[PDB]
Design a protein around this ligand. Sequence first.
Ligand SMILES: C/C(=C\c1ccc(C(=O)O)cc1)c1ccc2c(c1)C(C)(C)CCC2(C)C
Length: 232
Amino acid sequence: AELDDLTEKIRKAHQETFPSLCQLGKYTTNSSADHRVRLDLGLWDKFSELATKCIIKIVEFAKRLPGFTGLTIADQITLLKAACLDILILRICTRYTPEQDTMTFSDGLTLNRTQMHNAGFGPLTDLVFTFANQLLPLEMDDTETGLLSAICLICGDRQDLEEPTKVDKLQEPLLEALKIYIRKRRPHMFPKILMKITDLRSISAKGAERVITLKMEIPGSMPPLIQEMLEN
Ligand SMILES: C/C(=C\c1ccc(C(=O)O)cc1)c1ccc2c(c1)C(C)(C)CCC2(C)C
């Protein structure tokens, strides 16, 4: 009952900070829609702008997680910076429309693969779409996506944690919660969803070089929160 209570709370934290694809008004753009280019600055400006907003929403999601507030701000910051890209990647991949081969952002902006590539994903584009495509068969809902996000976040083995053991105990209930929910809702889903964390980490790891490359390409400055996120 306390685990059913935790599950409902995580689902809510997610739903409140992440607009569903079905509850969003999709809109497109014709900017470099059919030709891949190094970087479309107009798409980068819009994309990076939305990235900043989503990062803020991720911090809000984290704050809504039971116990997170309890940890020290130092630990809150370490956990967030280590898992933010993972979560940003999972979020955009959850708004993938296979028929149109597009992904939709929080404000309804819907870009095709080419535009995703041109907005900044570059050489990581196909890798991201493949992750999104492999996500579909799992048919996950708000609570599973939220529990997965929380599992990516609450990791007590992150380096520089002031209270690693306290973090471990906060994640302990998460795996069980997910275990139980998966079997109560749609009766091998447990390990398949968990394996995705690895795929996720693998992709976010490629972000370190990507940001350096983008910085070298843009005429302006890298948005402060993105900077802070990969600044480590
Ligand atoms: C995945 C991402 C940003 C993002 C995710 C979701 C929304 C939304 O509105 O729902 C908006 C933006 C992102 C952010 C930064 C970076 C990347 C992706 C890649 C993977 C291209 C590597 C380089 C940096 C700049 C770190």
